[PDB]
Design a protein around this ligand. Structure first.
Ligand SMILES: NC(=O)C1=CN([C@@H]2O[C@H](COP(=O)(O)OP(=O)(O)OC[C@H]3O[C@@H](n4cnc5c(N)ncnc54)[C@H](OP(=O)(O)O)[C@@H]3O)[C@@H](O)[C@H]2O)C=CC1
Ligand SMILES: NC(=O)C1=CN([C@@H]2O[C@H](COP(=O)(O)OP(=O)(O)OC[C@H]3O[C@@H](n4cnc5c(N)ncnc54)[C@H](OP(=O)(O)O)[C@@H]3O)[C@@H](O)[C@H]2O)C=CC1
Ligand SMILES: NC(=O)C1=CN([C@@H]2O[C@H](COP(=O)(O)OP(=O)(O)OC[C@H]3O[C@@H](n4cnc5c(N)ncnc54)[C@H](OP(=O)(O)O)[C@@H]3O)[C@@H](O)[C@H]2O)C=CC1
Ligand SMILES: NC(=O)C1=CN([C@@H]2O[C@H](COP(=O)(O)OP(=O)(O)OC[C@H]3O[C@@H](n4cnc5c(N)ncnc54)[C@H](OP(=O)(O)O)[C@@H]3O)[C@@H](O)[C@H]2O)C=CC1
Ligand SMILES: O=S1(=O)N=C(NC2CCCCC2)O[C@H]2CCCC[C@H]21
Ligand SMILES: O=S1(=O)N=C(NC2CCCCC2)O[C@H]2CCCC[C@H]21
Ligand SMILES: O=S1(=O)N=C(NC2CCCCC2)O[C@H]2CCCC[C@H]21
Ligand SMILES: O=S1(=O)N=C(NC2CCCCC2)O[C@H]2CCCC[C@H]21
Lengths: 263, 266, 264, 263
């Protein structure tokens, strides 16, 4: 059940939020928006020097508190330990923003099992490890899980097959536990964010010469992810095309989920 | 891909070289029997050495051009890679790869079972990728087909099967994206994704015991519809007891979006 | 149009001035009863004065702010125009126009019955247009609502009801086109199209007897669902036993095409 | 049940065809294509002077025969008598092409009920009267009914409300009788043509505009091939979005819940 209210930046004031993949791009823009809202933030990514700079800017913007923990989400021990440390720094957890992805470029799939497994481990499995480690704190606070996904996580997309598989897996996993939490009365919301092309340095470089469309602003995108999570909405759609929002919706899937629940 | 604009006939499988994974029992075993009756060459796999021998003997009795088994676990990526090479040598090539095995799954609330999530991802998804890579040179030689067995839980959220659902959704994203790559790269290997509802296999029936459920569809007809879709090079096959579910779960809006996004790249 | 970004509550109809056509029986009668319970002012119409009298009696008892009837045939475009003016006088204005009447129809294959095709177009479609023209000045003053009752046969082809299907499809074409016109001309009058499946009315139960084997949804909740759609200023609403009927409304491909073409 | 053959102009050789609204625009272009194919043509519209020039040009183009019968489709007695006359002259009827409309300009609906009624009578009711009159001859030849419609006959369009109502009515009526014919074994095909903006003198004055000559040939093709729907527009994105597969699936599923054996 989402909040039938309009978003207010005050909803995040004093909230204890983790943002992963927060050294750059959308993740960094989220940490900044949260800081301006006066949230307590714990940021993570591999790059410690850039995470240092992010935390310092968060404090300038007005974050209630800001800390970083550096490590790779390839390392499942780090993922589990990071949540416990982040929780101890803030005295709890209200929102878990799962955003990091392994480095990926546009290429036809041929024999690249390494990139398929790496995408699955980093983009999907670590999200599950982080969720398990965070849930006790989120159940205590009636908190929220925010999962960053893509158009390639809802429809087939050539040149990003391993990435698409990892994003599709997030939908299957997180949408299925959302139904389980509903019937078991676990009051932790799950927001799946479906994004189109965003003007991050990573995406702009990856798509240069190959895919040409725009390219919605990263600042506005980060805010839409936070708003959807704050409002406990099931899904957020953020793309520059009006065709997307209308056609991406799946009432047929929603009908089937309702019909197969009464069994 | 472009499907074959014709009616299926069992002679389409006569002398064809087919791998069936997860073929010691359930739908996989039924598929092996259908292919044997059609006069195909079959190489079956699963872990169960003894039941695989029995399935192989019955396949020969039904009319298989040839039938052999290779036992092993698809948790082992080395076995998956070696199995394809050996199946290929046994038949002298490969025309159709039917990816059907799954790891053991029950209906349970997800709590902290990362081990089951990882094992489902490894067996149900990654091993199908490894098998495809190993089989691809032979399939490109024969203008062959990959048949991927999936579920309603691979298209919509289903509670109590989160890890299974995640792995079946992953198959869709992977296989559908490479299908788009093959169409533009002119790789004449078809990819068929099969979306099944509840089927009366011993595994599923035991799994749904203790729960109210809809009518389970028959495993023999199910297995035949999977082969038909693959033989006809169709993109997707839907098979469920309900005609309403079968026809309405198919997503033309997604197909429209895929077409729209395709115009924005080179 | 912009729908009400809020949950429906029966107090939304309190003191509202509502016309309900085809309200002597079936869904129209149930809608009058719901509005009566909500404290609305109601004016009911149909051809039968005796049955309309019984409806008004129950409405007054249920707690309607005021309840009246005007008997006449919607085959007569002069009666249609005059009925609205007279209904507006009885209430001192108009907030909601619920178009629900249809001409008598049975299930049959189409052969040479042009009379039934014409009568269906006149009663089920043309009179709705005449009633709308007559109501619009009052609706414009109150920022009112038009509610149009339609069917599965108004969104898909339906054998045995071809003349009926043609009239319901006509309502969609006409009312959906004027809704686009009201958005450009900035007319703050909402238009709601209601897509209904089989409802347990005496008429439909008799008409489907031995032909259709399907679950008939209840008229009481059907009636409230129509009222809610109008009260929330929603463009399209549905009511049927099957959840799959949702696919007949809010069609995304149709919305994109409409957006595309208007901007050109 | 469409003919699974490629179109060939010989399919219309010696066929007995009625074309309504054939003195100008699309109708005139259809009359000309049918003439080049060596069909027997009977054309109609109100204006004898323009119909005379169409007939003369049809004969020059190679028509097996070409004649006109002038009248208004506002008159239902004329509509019924016209079909009897045209069919008695040709010695039968293989195809009925219903193309005429009442004169219409782009305007907001402005209490002009007279225009709504005339559009319904001419654009819709006369098509039903023409069908009833033609049905016995069409049953004898296993013939075809071709109904010319519009994008405004499938989606809402401001400024053509009366026109849209009448085109939507054609869809409901003709698509419902096609389903009745299918079960009653009436071997008369019904083709609904959904046209976008065409470069006719009328449309160009009233308003990317598709050519009228290719439009006319596409209508004939779909009718000859017994297709249920023909879509013709300059934009490939329009042709993609105009289809409604959910509607066709639901029509089939609803058919499983009724028994028509009584009729
Ligand atoms: N940009 C776009 O067009 C779109 C983006 N998205 C989604 O938005 C999210 C962010 O995208 P975007 O900001 O463009 O990407 P960026 O590459 O800009 O940032 C990804 C972040 O993840 C971190 N990261 C990378 N590898 C690891 C690792 N092994 N362990 C831990 N952290 C890691 C990176 O930092 P560091 O290198 O310091 O570790 C970085 O902070 C993703 O989930 C993506 O799928 C969805 C649709 C489109
Ligand atoms: N039955 C149903 O209701 C539905 C089934 N499906 C799909 O159909 C397919 C078959 O289902 P079903 O026949 O019901 O299931 P079964 O459990 O009957 O068969 C699964 C097969 O996989 C084999 N297998 C299990 N573990 C491994 C392993 N680690 N390595 C290799 N092979 C293994 C099993 O044999 P062994 O133990 O000898 O290894 C068996 O032959 C699956 O892809 C499933 O998701 C989809 C929707 C519904
Ligand atoms: N019932 C169902 O299954 C479904 C109903 N619908 C729609 O719901 C609406 C109501 O259906 P339902 O309640 O079943 O119908 P009813 O037959 O119960 O009532 C129709 C109403 O219209 C009146 N009426 C009939 N002819 C005329 C006329 N010439 N002039 C004025 N009023 C007239 C009738 O009264 P009187 O005879 O006294 O004039 C009666 O009050 C209709 O729009 C219908 O299309 C849509 C789908 C399914
Ligand atoms: N052109 C376009 O952009 C589009 C056209 N269409 C459809 O294509 C068809 C033809 O359009 P188009 O060629 O542009 O139209 P035109 O105006 O060019 O021709 C209309 C024809 O109908 C005749 N007609 C008019 N009033 C009557 C009447 N009362 N009785 C009999 N015949 C009459 C006219 O002749 P006369 O006045 O001598 O009687 C003329 O022959 C129509 O069905 C229209 O809805 C659909 C989408 C777009
Ligand atoms: O909107 S998406 O589906 N996701 C993304 N995600 C990016 C893919 C490359 C790594 C950064 C994220 O990119 C778009 C452009 C390339 C193809 C897929 C589309
Ligand atoms: O049709 S399904 O989505 N797939 C399956 N797949 C089975 C899951 C249990 C083990 C064998 C396969 O089961 C159905 C019943 C349990 C819930 C999901 C549905
Ligand atoms: O839902 S509907 O399309 N509308 C109706 N409308 C009724 C048709 C007969 C008179 C009362 C209204 O009936 C349903 C059952 C018969 C076939 C059509 C379907
Ligand atoms: O393609 S249509 O839907 N049909 C038409 N039909 C014409 C409408 C005016 C008279 C000639 C036919 O025109 C297009 C341009 C005006 C608005 C609607 C679109």
């Amino acid at each position: 059940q989402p909040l039938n209210e309009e978003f207010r930046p005050e909803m995040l004031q004093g909230k204890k939020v983790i943002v992963t993949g927060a050294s750059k791009g959308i993740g960094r823009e989220m940490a900044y928006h949260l800081a301006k809202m006066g949230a307590h933030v714990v940021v993570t990514a591999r790059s410690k020097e850039t995470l240092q700079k992010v935390v310092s800017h968060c404090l300038e913007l007005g974050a209630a508190s800001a800390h970083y923990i550096a490590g790779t989400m390839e390392d499942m021990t780090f993922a589990e330990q990071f949540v416990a440390q982040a929780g101890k720094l803030m005295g709890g957890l209200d929102m878990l923003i799962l955003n990091h992805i392994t480095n990926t470029s546009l290429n036809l799939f041929h024999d690249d099992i390494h990139h398929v497994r790496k995408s699955m481990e980093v983009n999907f499995l670590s999200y599950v490890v982080l969720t398990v480690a965070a849930l006790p704190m989120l159940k205590q606070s009636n908190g929220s899980i925010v999962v960053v996904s893509s158009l390639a996580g809802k429809v087939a997309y050539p040149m990003v097959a391993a990435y698409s598989a990892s994003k599709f897996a997030l939908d299957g996993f997180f949408s299925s536990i959302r139904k389980e939490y509903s019937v078991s009365r676990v009051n932790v919301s799950i927001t799946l964010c479906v994004l189109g092309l965003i003007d991050t340095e990573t995406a702009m470089k990856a798509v240069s010469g190959i895919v040409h469309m725009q390219a919605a602003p990263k600042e506005e995108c980060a805010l839409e992810i936070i708003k959807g999570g704050a409002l406990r909405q099931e899904e957020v759609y953020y793309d520059s095309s009006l065709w997307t929002t209308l056609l991406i919706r799946n009432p047929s899937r929603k009908i089937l989920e309702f019909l197969y629940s009464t069994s």
